[PDB]
């Protein structure tokens, strides 16, 4: 009767709904009883420090478990042959065949083999021994403690920040651009130049010697003379064996481009020069805003003055400053949309341009990292649109936003939504129709009749960056071009070697199957956007429910009247778009993984011929690659893919269990539960035990969430088991 102490409406509920709803509304601090704005921003600040610490404890845990139980020192000796160990297994349910089957990695105990790539990342950035992985784990435990104490400290009465501090947009932007983005990128260049570059070249540099070991033989004298090009002189040779002194140069900043020939990763001197460039740029960008000394920009002044004189945007951005600052949901939506695009950039640029030594030969790690970050990307992008819907319901004031960009977006909400409906339908009808055309014609024994459309626009883009496969002779592909001549002395020789060589995932060859799947991804991104945009724009009202704002973000329905109002809330369009997010990241990761496993065999033509129809995707990707995974255990034994073999079935179960919450709805279950309440009260020896909370069926919104969680968890666990076990079992 007092668990949701933040909610008296839930704390007086006599049912089991109180526990569920108190657990599910716990982090929605804005909705808590008697919540002021001061207390809202100060609890968010302290709980952001708790998230900071959880991240640091998670990273310290990965470092500790690899330092303790991993084979990092064995792996760094021979990184292409040794399989990295994540942590050991102590499971009292194992049989002795299971214990023997997981005893890989060169150790004497069962282990999980790491798919996270942390070995390649820690190898590349300098770590050599278990002592420094452990030292990193210790330092992160200290930092986690520092940020937990900071979270407690900024909850103390003298140390409580005011709302004037929390909304100082200019000082926060100045410091996050110049200190958090820029100076830490500059400090990361210092780590590469001072530690990672020398230790990639055999010379150990630690805290014990880094003030008496110069990164460059000349040493901070060329920098303080303008002779900066002396830091690019004598780069690492193509004969360099990573981690050793043979083939090593003395340069610490280069723009060679392409990849280190042995590790098949970006040059660490390119990465050090990248973070130096991006650091200075971000530091300069962090001097943009006026704080205390009269130079800089006021964000209010910039936003108010950007109204085009033609009047096409109305009042423009007048009043957008206040809306953004006052609305934490508008900020969360901008932050999550921005972050979601970046983790999609992270997934796309880390497989094509890997930075870590001897990764991109760890095919399981490449598949897991790409799949992981694309799923994180889809979650962040859907959440951005969710919090835009929450912004419109909760924080958007139409009077304060008269004729703005925001009001005028709502004014044409139907033009936006109907054109997203058109483009979704357009793409879906044709992409599916071309795929079905191809399936029917191939089935009828006539593969030639297939509508195979070359991806010429993308091929032109590849050629424009120097791919010579398509013979476009555009820009970099043409030897005598202004673009080619300009970059010839700096990054083009390495880039042309990297792009033209077929040993890397840089600008991988694209054909008709690639075109069709890209259009499928376009239908998926447009359809998820349609559902999310329809939810955000119709969040505050619709013809079916004009006063939808008055009911909130997440409500079940408005009842069976007016024809029926199931899934009418903006939350329910989040709910419906979550399936479309899962479907699109499914199409993306299925495409990435199938194209890569076919290239990794040396059989890229198998994707080229089978991806243009859907039975090729069914038999040649899902059915063909299932066999190492589903044979992880059988009546003839088991091997170390048994865990993924069990997880794959576990994902199928959770996913299907989600269907129970999504297909079967409340009234059936409340009528079951009332017969169980009768039976418990009428059973002798059992009616001595009484519930404190009346058993009720799950709510309409709660069951939609429970089915969505089960569907999503089943989706993730099934695909993670498949993408890891098929790649591990195949090794290619």
């Amino acid at each position: 009767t007092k668990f949701p102490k933040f909610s008296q409406a839930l704390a007086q509920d006599p049912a089991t709904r109180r526990i569920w709803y108190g657990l599910a509304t716990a982090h929605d601090l804005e909705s808590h009883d008697g919540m002021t704005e001061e207390n809202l921003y100060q609890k968010i600040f302290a709980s952001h420090f708790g998230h900071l610490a959880v991240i640091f404890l998670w990273t310290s845990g990965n470092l500790f478990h690899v330092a303790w139980q991993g084979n990092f020192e064995q792996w760094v000796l021979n990184p292409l042959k040794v399989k990295p160990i994540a942590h050991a297994i102590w499971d009292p349910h194992f049989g002795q065949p299971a214990v023997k089957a997981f005893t890989k990695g060169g150790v004497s105990y069962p282990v999980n083999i790491a798919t996270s790539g942390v070995y390649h990342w820690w190898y590349t950035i300098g770590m050599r021994s278990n002592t420094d992985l452990y030292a990193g784990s210790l330092f992160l435990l200290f930092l986690a403690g520092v940020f937990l104490f900071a979270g407690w400290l900024h909850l103390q009465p003298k140390f409580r920040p005011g709302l004037s501090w929390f909304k100082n947009n200019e000082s926060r932007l100045n410091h996050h651009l110049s200190g958090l983005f820029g100076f830490s990128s500059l400090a990361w260049s210092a780590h590469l130049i001072h530690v990672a570059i020398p230790e990639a070249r055999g010379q150990h540099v630690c805290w014990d010697n880094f003030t008496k070991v110069a990164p460059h033989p000349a040493g901070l004298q060329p920098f303080f003379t303008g002779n900066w090009g002396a830091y690019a002189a004598s780069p690492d040779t193509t004969n360099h064996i990573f981690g050793t002194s043979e083939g090593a140069g003395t340069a610490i900043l280069t723009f060679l481009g392409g990849f280190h020939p042995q590790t098949q990763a970006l040059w660490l001197t390119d990465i050090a020069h990248h973070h130096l460039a991006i650091g200075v740029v971000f530091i300069f960008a962090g001097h943009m805003y006026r704080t205390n000394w009269g130079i800089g920009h006021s964000l209010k002044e910039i936003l108010d003055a950007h109204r085009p004189p033609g009047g096409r945007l109305g009042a423009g951005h007048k009043g957008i400053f206040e809306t953004l600052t006052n609305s934490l949901h508008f900020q969360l939506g901008l932050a999550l949309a921005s972050l979601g695009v970046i983790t999609s950039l992270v997934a796309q640029h880390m497989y094509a341009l890997p930075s870590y030594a001897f990764i991109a030969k760890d095919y399981v790690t490449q598949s897991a990292l790409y799949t992981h970050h694309q799923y994180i990307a889809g979650f962040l992008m859907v959440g951005a649109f969710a919090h835009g819907a929450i912004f419109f319901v909760r924080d958007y004031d139409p009077e304060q936003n008269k004729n703005n960009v925001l009001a005028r977006i709502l004014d044409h909400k139907e033009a936006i939504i109907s054109h997203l409906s058109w483009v979704s339908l357009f793409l879906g009808f044709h992409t599916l129709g071309i795929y079905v055309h191809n399936d029917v014609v191939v089935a009828f024994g006539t593969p030639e009749k297939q509508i195979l459309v070359e991806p010429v626009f993308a091929q032109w883009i590849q050629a424009s960056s120097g791919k010579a496969l398509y013979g476009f002779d555009v820009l970099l592909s043409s030897t005598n071009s202004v673009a080619a001549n300009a970059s010839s002395n700096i990054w083009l020789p390495g880039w042309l070697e990297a792009i033209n060589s077929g040993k890397n995932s840089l600008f991988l060859p694209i054909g008709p199957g690639d075109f069709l799947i890209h259009h499928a991804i376009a239908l998926a991104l447009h359809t998820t956007t349609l559902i999310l945009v329809k939810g955000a724009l119709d969040a505050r009202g619709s013809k079916l429910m004009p006063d939808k704002k008055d009911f909130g973000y997440a409500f079940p329905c408005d009842g069976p009247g007016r024809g029926g109002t199931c899934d009418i809330s903006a939350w329910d369009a989040f709910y419906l778009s979550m399936f479309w997010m899962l479907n699109t990241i499914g199409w993306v990761t299925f495409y990435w993984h199938w194209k890569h496993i076919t290239i990794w065999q040396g059989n890229a033509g198998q994707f080229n011929e089978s991806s243009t129809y859907i039975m090729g995707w069914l038999r040649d990707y899902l059915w063909l690659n299932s066999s190492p995974l589903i044979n992880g255990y059988n009546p003839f034994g088991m091997n170390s893919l048994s865990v993924w073999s069990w997880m794959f079935l576990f994902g199928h179960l959770i996913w299907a269990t989600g269907f129970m919450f999504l297909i079967s709805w409340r009234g059936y279950w409340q009528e079951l539960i009332e017969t169980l309440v009768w039976a418990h009260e009428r059973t002798p020896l059992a009616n001595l035990v009484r519930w404190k909370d009346k058993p009720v069926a799950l709510s309409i919104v709660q069951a939609r969430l429970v089915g969505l969680i089960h569907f999503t968890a089943g989706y993730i666990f099934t695909y993670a088991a498949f993408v890891i076990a098929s790649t591990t079992g195949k090794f290619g």
């Binding site: 002021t36 319901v393 924080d395 958007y396 004031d397 505050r540 004009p546 008055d550 009768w678 009260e681």
Partner: protein
């Protein structure tokens, strides 16, 4: 006015759909009505019972259970003589329906309007306006 606890009840052979421990520990509802006949009706909680000629008394676990029987008795047997009471475990009897002797669908003097909003529904305040202030969204 008060519930006469001695009113005889309709002939029901019992059912499992009746009231549970919350009726004897939280609240119970009773419905009384006068019938001109010895006639069979359907229980809200199950099968069929026979209402006796004269005055009948029922014990249900919900007010909707009472009002469901009230509608069945008014549409099929034309009884308009139904009084719905909420009986606390303390023994307090609370008269409920019709609350002032006249049905809610008929106007009655001395009824004060509760929940009435002076404007139409499209003039409700936006949630941003009522955020971080105690002011209500109905204007």
């Amino acid at each position: 006015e008060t519930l006469n606890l001695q009113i005889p009840s309709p002939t029901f052979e019992g059912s499992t759909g009746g009231w549970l421990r919350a009726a004897e520990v939280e609240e119970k509802y009773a419905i009384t009505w006068t019938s001109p006949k010895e006639q069979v009706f359907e229980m809200p909680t199950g099968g069929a019972a026979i209402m006796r000629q004269g005055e009948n008394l029922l014990y249900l676990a919900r007010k909707e259970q009472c009002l469901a029987l009230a509608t069945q008795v008014k549409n099929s047997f034309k009884i308009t003589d139904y009084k719905v009471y909420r009986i606390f475990p303390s023994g307090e009897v609370q008269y409920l329906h019709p609350k002032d002797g006249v049905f809610p669908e008929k106007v009655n003097a001395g009824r004060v309007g509760v929940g009435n909003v002076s404007h139409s529904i499209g003039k409700n305040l936006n949630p941003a306006q009522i955020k971080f202030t105690s002011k209500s969204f109905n204007g």
